[PDB]
Design a protein around this ligand. Structure first.
Ligand SMILES: Nc1ncnc2c1ncn2[C@@H]1O[C@H](COP(=O)(O)OP(=O)(O)NP(=O)(O)O)[C@@H](O)[C@H]1O
Ligand SMILES: [Zn+2]
Ligand SMILES: [Zn+2]
Lengths: 221, 242
């Protein structure tokens, strides 16, 4: 019911992204915005998803957001593509499998002061994670590299399933304000370990907007 | 590859059971035996078909290579319990061989105890799984009769707004089914570490894990018999928390 009043952007519509898109659609999220870069992949996903739950609204884009020109458009849609035009999306989800795209999303979110979550799964399928980022309040993707160790074909879609479900659950807890949102939640599939933590921002982060947001956040006193 | 050589029985094709059946089918499990006893009340046009034949139609369409055997009876009846034991002992990939794993995805204690009674009689390893009515917690448990606690060794373990639940339920089922299946793969394929018990608290992203030793005074004498057979086997080197 209340869930129908939110919009979520999802970047990366393969692997963890398709499962996540499908779960959110099945929950009746008001709007999903889909970004990927090859009907194209996103318009294909939109078609399948709208069949699953026609209550959900979609907007899709197929451009490479790592060029500054497309990055402009990406930021425009984050800021204005909410359920009602001209309002921001409530959350951005990174379900991408490369560093450049991920860092690209981090740069947009730092610029906009947009809360987002990033997720990943290993090629080997033995591990994955989700993380919440609140620019200026918690570590962004540029503040520090990933340091949490993984204490050492069928498995791969399964691990994607677990990570996607945990992601969606945290999206629901964030949008609907119940339980506790995780800041970092890891998944070691071989051991059934779920390491968790949160990290403060790096005051010397390379991302000058992360730095800017931190100051703005501190200033609230 | 190797996963194609295994047979898995799933009791209860409801929430976690259907997700689980679907994942296993997508993995290319050799065979699924499906047991349940009510009708579709999934996709809306199956409303009236038995749950088991409906799931079978969907799953076959997903992966035609998996072999399906389905039964639509109440296993808590002695007569149907005989049939159930027959298919567990003999409904393996090769007929006359046991099923490699039984998965309990039923919603009630009686059916769980029923599956437990069969598995102790047969010495059949199984996993008991569930999602709470509150929609924000679930669990999986590995029962190796004689080696780990059976469902009767101790009473039921518990893992500590409507719109919340209505949204959460499907996704908690997803998480629990996913972790169940990962454990099924780890158990069948023998890699990594299989959890004897794993709970999931969705409110706090808590995944408590432990194992339980058998209760040497279990009400189930087959449990006890199975314990002594296991104690014979090992005989050289297992402490409880004090
Ligand atoms: N004695 C029984 N024999 C066969 N099937 C059963 C029995 N008891 C329960 N079931 C089925 O088990 C399923 C339970 O699913 P559900 O109520 O969705 O809970 P869950 O969270 O999936 N575990 C239902 O489809 C029941 O019809
Ligand atoms: Zn930073
Ligand atoms: Zn017992």
């Amino acid at each position: 019911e209340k869930i129908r009043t939110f919009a979520v952007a999802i970047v990366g519509v393969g692997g963890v992204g398709s499962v996540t898109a499908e779960m959110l659609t099945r929950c009746g999220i008001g709007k999903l915005l889909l970004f990927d870069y090859d009907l194209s992949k996103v318009q294909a996903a939109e078609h399948t998803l709208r069949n699953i739950n026609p209550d959900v609204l979609f907007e899709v884009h197929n451009y490479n957001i790592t060029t500054v020109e497309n990055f402009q458009h990406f930021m425009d849609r984050i800021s204005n593509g909410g359920l009602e035009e001209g309002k921001p999306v409530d959350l951005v989800l990174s379900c991408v499998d490369n560093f450049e795209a991920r860092m690209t999303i981090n740069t947009a979110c730092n610029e906009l002061g947009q809360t987002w979550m990033e997720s990943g799964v290993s090629e080997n399928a033995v591990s994955g994670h989700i993380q919440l980022i609140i620019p200026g309040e918690s570590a962004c993707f540029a503040c520090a590299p990933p340091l949490v160790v993984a204490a050492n074909a069928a498995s791969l879609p399964t691990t994607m399933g677990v990570v996607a479900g945990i992601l969606v659950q945290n999206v629901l807890k964030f949008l609907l304000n119940f339980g506790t949102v995780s800041f970092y939640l890891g998944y070691n599939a071989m051991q059934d370990f779920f390491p968790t933590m949160s990290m403060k921002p790096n005051p010397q982060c390379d991302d000058r907007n992360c730095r800017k947001q931190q100051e703005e956040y501190k200033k609230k006193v």
